[PDB]
């Protein structure tokens, strides 16, 4: 059992755009799981995965797929802008995002990235 | 607002059939998220929810969908056996299971269920 890897998680609750929001980040070997929940809802699940290999002069293209919940164009844009930096800083691991945020704005998204940053596990 | 949880989560690490296993259970308004991880992997993502044709078996038969990972028959039977009781007890909430178990066994399955019990959030 020597060298079993630890599954690492960190959470914070913060008021974001006036609304109480809990963020949890959990690091697996292939994925970072990012959970952003308002009003106790699990929300929509979005898979974000690199679809090209990184180089010295390029970041991987990220493809998004809604796995559960409301599949709307805005959620793909929102997920990508929310957690692209997580994938890129975590060795180009994929991200599994559970996001329950009713009122999406660039304001809330930038505030949420800061909370994610506080909950870094990569 | 304090830095305190909005949703309840319980976790436990246990050696199961010789393999250190991390279990985390989190309760959402309409879902229970259960993570069962060995060897640092996120594993297969499986949604489980009470069938709509499923009437008066006091436990509905469950509909299972692999959302991420290998979609093959055995992981569906494993998921049902592992967490049917979660859904039944949780107010028939849906279950989203992330499961990475290297060697499935009757012994292992039963022991895993006891760890999930220790993480009861419903």
Curated annotation (Swiss-Prot), chains A, B:
Keywords: Acetylation, Chaperone
One GO-annotated biological process of the protein: chaperone-mediated protein complex assembly
Record GO cellular component, one term: protein-containing complex
Signal peptide stretch: none
Keyword Acyltransferase listed: no
Entry-linked InterPro entries: Proteasome_assmbl_chp_3, Psm_Assembly_Chaperone
GO molecular function: molecular adaptor activity; protein-containing complex binding
Subunit note: Homodimer. Interacts with PSMG4. Interacts directly with alpha and beta subunits of the 20S proteasome but dissociates before the formation of half-proteasomes, probably upon recruitment of POMP.
Family: Belongs to the PSMG3 family.
Job description of the protein: Chaperone protein which promotes assembly of the 20S proteasome. May cooperate with PSMG1-PSMG2 heterodimers to orchestrate the correct assembly of proteasomes.
Protein name per Swiss-Prot or TrEMBL: Proteasome assembly chaperone 3
Source taxonomy: Eukaryota, Metazoa, Chordata, Craniata, Vertebrata
Gene: PSMG3
């Amino acid at each position: 059992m020597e060298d079993t890897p630890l599954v690492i998680s960190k959470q914070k609750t913060e008021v974001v755009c006036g609304v109480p929001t809990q963020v949890v980040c959990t690091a697996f070997s292939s994925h970072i799981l990012v959970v952003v929940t308002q009003f106790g809802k699990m929300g929509t699940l979005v898979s974000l995965e690199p679809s090209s290999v990184a180089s010295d002069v390029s970041k991987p293209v990220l493809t998004t797929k809604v796995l559960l919940g409301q599949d709307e164009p805005l959620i793909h844009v929102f997920a990508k802008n929310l957690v692209a930096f997580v994938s890129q800083e975590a060795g180009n691991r994929a991200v599994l995002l559970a996001v329950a945020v009713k009122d999406k704005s660039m304001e809330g998204l930038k505030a949420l990235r800061e909370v994610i940053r506080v909950c870094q596990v990569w």
